[PDB]
């Protein structure tokens, strides 16, 4: 998770937009960061048609087993890597695929 190139740790929403702005507002450009409003969770910040969108990722526990979800448990992931890898191939609730990592 921390090892992953697309993970930026504790950065703000404005900062994510500045970073995505640096790298040209390319469609499907993305990063994952910690949420400022929800420090227990994460945000997938994604550029689509030159607008940056922010998708909240929250932890939940089912029968003592942690999962992450962007849609109140309709789609569940063991960790951020699984979430990212799924959405590189499947749009799910997103408006586009995760195409390029914001470094």
């Amino acid at each position: 998770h921390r090892t992953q190139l697309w993970f930026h740790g504790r950065i703000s929403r404005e900062e994510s937009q500045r970073l995505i702005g640096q790298q040209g507002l390319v469609d499907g450009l993305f990063l994952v960061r910690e949420s400022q409003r929800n420090p227990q969770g994460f945000v997938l910040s994604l550029c689509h048609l030159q607008k940056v969108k922010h998708y909240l990722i929250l932890p939940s526990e089912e029968e003592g087993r942690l999962y992450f979800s962007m849609d109140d448990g309709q789609t569940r992931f063991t960790d951020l890597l699984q979430l990212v890898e799924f959405h590189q191939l499947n749009r799910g609730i997103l408006p586009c695929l995760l195409r390029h990592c914001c470094t």
Partner: peptide
């Protein structure tokens, strides 16, 4: 589903 985020907007 979350105020202030784009999840399943609108």
């Amino acid at each position: 589903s979350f105020e202030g985020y784009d999840n399943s907007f609108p």
